[PDB]
Amino acid sequence: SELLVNTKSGKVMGTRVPVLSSHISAFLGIPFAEPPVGNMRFRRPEPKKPWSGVWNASTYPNNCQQYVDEQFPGFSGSEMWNPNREMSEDCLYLNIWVPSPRPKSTTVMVWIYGGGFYSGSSTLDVYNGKYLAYTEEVVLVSLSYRVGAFGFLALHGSQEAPGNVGLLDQRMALQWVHDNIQFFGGDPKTVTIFGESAGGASVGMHILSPGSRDLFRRAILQSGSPNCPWASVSVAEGRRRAVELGRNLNCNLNSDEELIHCLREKKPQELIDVEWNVLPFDSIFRFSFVPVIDGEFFPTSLESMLNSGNFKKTQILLGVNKDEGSFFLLYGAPGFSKDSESKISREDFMSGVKLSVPHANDLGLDAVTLQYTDWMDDNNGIKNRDGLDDIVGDHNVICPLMHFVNKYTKFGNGTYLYFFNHRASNLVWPEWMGVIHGYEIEFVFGLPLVKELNYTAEEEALSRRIMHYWATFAKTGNPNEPHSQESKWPLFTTKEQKFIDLNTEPMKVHQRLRVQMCVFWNQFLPKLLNAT
Amino acid sequence: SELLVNTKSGKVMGTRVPVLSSHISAFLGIPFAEPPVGNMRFRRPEPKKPWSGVWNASTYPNNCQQYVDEQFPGFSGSEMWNPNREMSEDCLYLNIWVPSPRPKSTTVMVWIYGGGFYSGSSTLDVYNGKYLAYTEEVVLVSLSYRVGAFGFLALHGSQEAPGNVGLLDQRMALQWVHDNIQFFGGDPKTVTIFGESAGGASVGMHILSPGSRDLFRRAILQSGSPNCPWASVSVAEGRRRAVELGRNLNCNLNSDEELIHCLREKKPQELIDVEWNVLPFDSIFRFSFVPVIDGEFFPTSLESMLNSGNFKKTQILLGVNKDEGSFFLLYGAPGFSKDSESKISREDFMSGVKLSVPHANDLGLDAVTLQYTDWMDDNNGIKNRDGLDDIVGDHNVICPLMHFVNKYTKFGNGTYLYFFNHRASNLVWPEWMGVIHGYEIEFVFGLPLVKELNYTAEEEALSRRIMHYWATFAKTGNPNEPHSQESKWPLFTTKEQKFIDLNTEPMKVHQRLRVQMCVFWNQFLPKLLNAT
Question: Which domain, by its residues, includes A308?
């Protein structure tokens, strides 16, 4: 039977699903690790033990235990990201969407969801691989990993919570796709991993980590790179927050074993209730428990790895959204409202720069302010709003990704850079937010193709171009069709530094994506804070 | 006789001179101090002793002993600034241009030439007061003062070379205009002093110094303000250069008396031959001997005086040229040539920033470079050239004057700001130099009116507007005609910060002259260098 697959871990029974008035197979909820519960909390994942009989994989698995956003009850705009299933510490499962009829050896794409390393589910609607699998004819896999303290608590030196166990979860899932995707029609020697936000940073992290390099062929990173100021911490800081977390739940702090044990005896929702209290600064776009530069998953520091060429040389396609910042100013910067034009005054502007560059002395806050203020119109509320929006995005997503792409391109075998600047017509968020963080995902998964979701004709077109770019790249390492007649997506080179915009308009090539600011955030400011 | 005047110092015989096919009286070379020769070198000026008989004032006096530019032998472009008379330590004289018939009590204007405090003459052609006196009907006085070491050597504590004796010379000249201009038809209670470059800085210095405040009514400052980075030094630095000068001429350095005596025995051209060797840095737009914040001529520091409102509150009219920098890059920055487009490479650009901000650490040089580089076109030779041109001007003339005008306007009784951005059609300098430093002077003195000099019809028009602005302001404290129908030169206010362009085009008002950069040069950079 087409829905029955015999893997190396046991037999799996999938289900047939409808898509764009046709059908494909779907194996949902396949396990790849032993339930990380009980004494296994904070501990590295262990391979799932084989099973006899057939595993029922026709319904989604549970969602990792996480923090849930309640800032806008009812609002689809924010709930479409919250977990849509029972949360449980027993979260390690993966989903496979296979074409019909089953391929013999087709291209594979593994999706790693984002969420700030503190949230995320594979089961969300926007992450439905059926549209993409069906339309591009690829085996779509979407894994899951532990988030928040559960997947990133770090007491370096102790094997009870080494840290980065969340990245290992992903590696585990990848190991399985490598040892078994062939029984699903997929070709293991041609797997592309791609992510967004924390997922884009995770991809970049597997490219750097020696232990993962051999498990994939190409990579796609969206609005996220490993060297982002929020994507990682030092063992010292990881240790500091591990303890402080323990201090909020009144735990014995005489030793690591002492602390870890107290934490393992707490209910999941108790570590989550106090999670946000460990941050070192009043900040925006920063998360408590995130990957830590331990010395194992990451040999040395990220910066020296990038400068030494110590990383998987392959092809990569990456890009960013026009307005990455807005989403975080709405939730944390004073002056922004989901229901107003949110024009910002001088006072709130400066309160914004303090919140955005939390690790900056008073001289740095001045540098940032000077670099982002039009003194000929200093009290223009729309300019202070759009300036704040820029600071948050440039510092957190764009200038960090441009530093990665430039360092990478020097030893890689192909780079393709994009700039998504199209605001979907059916967005429920205010206009001042613009091309919001993460909203390029719907086009990647092809949601515009389903009529009932209400996208325009040109939007559905954009979605097909993009699915064909991602899918073509995943297969060949080049987003462009061999002898096509369409516009070519030029290659990014240390010299030209070309890139393209991705919107419903005639492709346009450009150069040096936001260099003026990228130089301020990568060269000048870093140096300034060092000298002062 | 109209050409005979009986002053409080003695009788003076002037001469009748032709101007625009008419005539006016001219008393040239009137003495106002005792010859500062011999043991009087570096010493404060003493009032000229009265004389019997009639003093012959029909020919120009001698020029102060100074450094002469020989960078372009023959070139009118540079020689029109060199001394046109025998140089002599016996330089303290003044020139008066009086209308015909002699007025009873007309407005007076006293001109103080510029020259970096190291050069300058009242006798230069461009400084001929006859055109202005005649055309506007004012008594035009042009004084002279000692420059270079001769007028600015400073060994604080010693009465043999207190320093600022060059500013005192000017004060002396002003004291005379105050005690005698009435016998020339001038009204002493309505005298306007105006200057350019070092002269503009001298004016501003009399506005600050208690000892001069009572000797004039209004002030006009052109391309120069007292708080310019080149206009003054500390007693410590003045002392350092006084000694080093002594070290170049092999002088005994055991004591001030020891040093001063050796210097007083040297021929004038010997102190000049080594003058430029005392500068502390490899620099551009910096001069050896300049005014020093002693504690007498200047009560406290200039910055605290400006913040405390400690200065003559009156009306002032001031402005700058579009391209103040160019002239100094030509002479000292590598890459610039009087005969080429002088496109600058990255290497020379950066060699330029080092030369322009001599007192800046490696972090500051980076700030300046980042603030003045278009990274989307970083290797555009015309952009690096125009950027360098801007740095030099903003840091040395514009951003410093805007800081003065803003501090002043807070306690003054009227401010009028202009921006001269018209390149004369007959200029002999290359185009890349633009609206060159000091070339607005010809319009102030009305040279365009004389046909044979070859100016265009619209240029002569511009010259008359300007002479009427300066002359009207000198008389009333407002550049505009009471009930005129012409365009009004708006007043500059802390709030609006309005100003006008001064060119052959329909007057246009604007706001915040170069604020983006002025904030970088007045607030950020200063602070940066302090913290680092």
Answer: 1-532
User: In this structure, what DSSP letter does residue A520 have?
Assistant: I
The C-alpha atoms of residue B293 and residue B296 are separated, in whole angstroms, by 8
| Backbone φ, ψ for residue B255 (5° rounding) | -160, 165
Contacts of B41 (CB under 8 A, 6+ apart): B89, B150, B263, B264
Q: CA-CA distance, B289 to B246, in Å (whole number)?
A: 13
* Best residue in B399, B403, B514, B528 for a mutation probing chain A (most A CBs within 10 Å): B528
Alpha-carbon distance of A484 to B63, in angstroms, equals: 80
Residue in the block written with tokens 């990957």:
A291
3-state SS, B210-231, equals HHHHCCCCEEEEECCCCCCCCC
What does the alpha-carbon distance between residue A134 and residue B490 come to, in Å, rounded to a whole number?
70
Is the backbone peptide bond immediately before A99 cis, with ω within 30 degrees of 0? no
Tokens of B340: 């080429």
| Residue given tokens 């920063």 in the structure block | A286
CA within 13 Å, CB half, A516: 11
Q: How far is CA B395 from the centre of its chain?
A: 17
Dihedral angle of Cα A241, A247, A249, A254, to the nearest 10 degrees: 110
Exposed (0-12), middle (13-18) or buried (19+): which is A159, by Cβ within 10 Å?
Answer: exposed
User: Could you tell me which residues come within 8 angstroms of residue A397 by beta carbon, excluding any fewer than 6 positions away?
Assistant: A223, A224, A225, A228, A320, A321, A324, A437
Distance CA A486, CA A4 (A): 40
Domain count along chain B: 1
Element (DSSP H or E) covering residue A111: strand A106-112
Residue with tokens 């046109």: B84
CA distances from A165 to A44, A357, B262 (A): 5, 28, 81
Judge if the upstream peptide bond of residue A18 is cis by omega within 30 degrees of 0: no
B333 DSSP 8-state letter: S
What's at A308, amino acid-wise? S
CA-atom Rg of chain B in angstroms? 23
Task: State the CATH number of the domain containing residue A359.
Answer: 3.40.50.1820
How many CA atoms does the CB half-sphere of A348 hold within 13 Å?
A: 23
- Alpha-carbon span A33 to A173, nearest angstrom: 8
Cα B61 from Cα B30, distance rounded (Å): 8
For testing the chain A interface, which of B346, B353, B361, B363 should be mutated: the one with the most A CBs within 10 Å? B363
Q: Show which residues on chain B lie within 8 Å of chain A, measured between beta carbons.
A: 363, 366-367, 370, 374-376, 511-512, 515-516, 519-520, 523-524, 527-528, 531-532
Nearest to A531 among B512, B515, B532 (CB): B532
Contact state of B519 with A376 under an 8 Å Cβ cutoff: no
The H or E element spanning position B18 is: strand B15-18
> Which chain A residues have a beta carbon less than 8 Å from that of B375?
512, 515-516, 519
DSSP B404-428: HHHHHHTTSS-EEEEEE----TT--
* C-beta separation of A394 from A457 below 8 A: no
The neighbouring-strand residues paired with B110 are B141, B193
Q: Name residues whose C-beta falls within 8 Å of residue A201's C-beta, 6 or more positions apart in sequence.
A: A114, A117, A195, A221, A224, A225, A226, A228, A231, A291
Q: Where does residue B345 fall: left (phi above 0), alpha (psi -120 to 50 degrees), or beta otherwise? A: beta
**CA distances, B275 to each of B50, B118, B269, B290 (Å):** 35, 10, 10, 12
Distance of CA B269 to the CA centre of its chain: 24
Angle A158-A164-A165 from CA coordinates, rounded to 5° = 80
Among B363, B512, B520, whose Cβ lies nearest the Cβ of A528? B363
For residues B217 and B190, give the distance between their C-alpha atoms in angstroms, rounded to a whole number.
6
Nearest CA to B143 out of B45, B238, B286 is that of: B45
Phi, psi of A406 (to 5 degrees): -70, -45
CB atoms within 10 A of CB A461: 13
